[PDB]
């Protein structure tokens, strides 16, 4: 009767509001920042989870920092299932943090719900202790540089081999398994370098291009 018309009007208004918010939701890309070691290089131009919003080339970007949470993470990690990118920052200094970080990356790489989410890997904290890895790992005395383009910013000693060996271990964990629909994106970043908002931009663009190519059955 007359009571039904008011419900229809309210539904129409709420549907219009949801239609307006759909474009806003679909026009922003969310990121999950994560890692142990110098995760305080947050550039901006108590609570549970902190949020940071920024625009690069007039594209919105959301970043989530996990704050006051327990050490165990097997439960709340499932929330970030549709996130465009998981930024994983791994310290490259050396108990034995590198092994634990590598194992955590392996665990998040072979998970059922995170099998589609893509991981952007940052290796910050450029090495200077290992200038004047070692015997912690066994496969270091018989590994050579994999014919990769050394940056050569003025000098590039065996530190190049050290960095590429760390990356090679990360990849051997990465590329030896995985059903598909995701890739790992290695990077070499300093503490700030005032350019880390661009690597994420390019990696997100590549992820979207790959997903759309796979959707059209072209690849």
């Amino acid at each position: 009767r007359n009571e039904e018309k008011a419900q229809r009007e309210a539904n129409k208004k709420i549907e219009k509001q949801l239609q307006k918010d759909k474009q806003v939701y679909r026009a922003t890309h969310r990121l999950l920042l994560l890692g142990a070691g110098e995760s305080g290089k947050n550039t901006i131009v108590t609570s549970g989870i902190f949020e940071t919003k920024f625009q690069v080339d007039k594209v919105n970007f959301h970043m989530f920092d996990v704050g006051a949470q327990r050490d165990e993470r097997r439960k709340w990690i499932q929330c970030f299932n549709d996130v465009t990118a998981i930024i994983f920052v791994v310290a490259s200094s050396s108990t034995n943090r590198l092994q634990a970080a590598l194992k955590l990356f392996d665990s998040i790489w072979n998970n059922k719900w995170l099998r589609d989410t893509s991981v952007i890997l940052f290796l910050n904290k450029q090495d200077l202790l290992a200038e004047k890895i070692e015997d912690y790992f066994p496969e270091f005395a018989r590994y050579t540089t994999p014919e990769d383009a050394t940056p050569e910013p003025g000098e590039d000693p065996r530190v190049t081999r050290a960095k590429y060996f760390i990356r090679d271990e990360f990849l051997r964990i990465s590329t030896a398994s995985g059903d598909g629909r995701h890739y790992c994106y290695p990077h070499f970043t300093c503490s700030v370098d005032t350019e880390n908002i661009r690597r994420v931009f390019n990696d997100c663009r590549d992820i979207i291009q790959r997903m759309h190519l796979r959707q059209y059955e072209l690849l």
Partner: peptide, 14 residues
Amino acid sequence: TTNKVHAIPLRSSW
């Protein structure tokens, strides 16, 4: 009647 009587936004998206 499959109608949305209310739709409340949330400060915390999670």
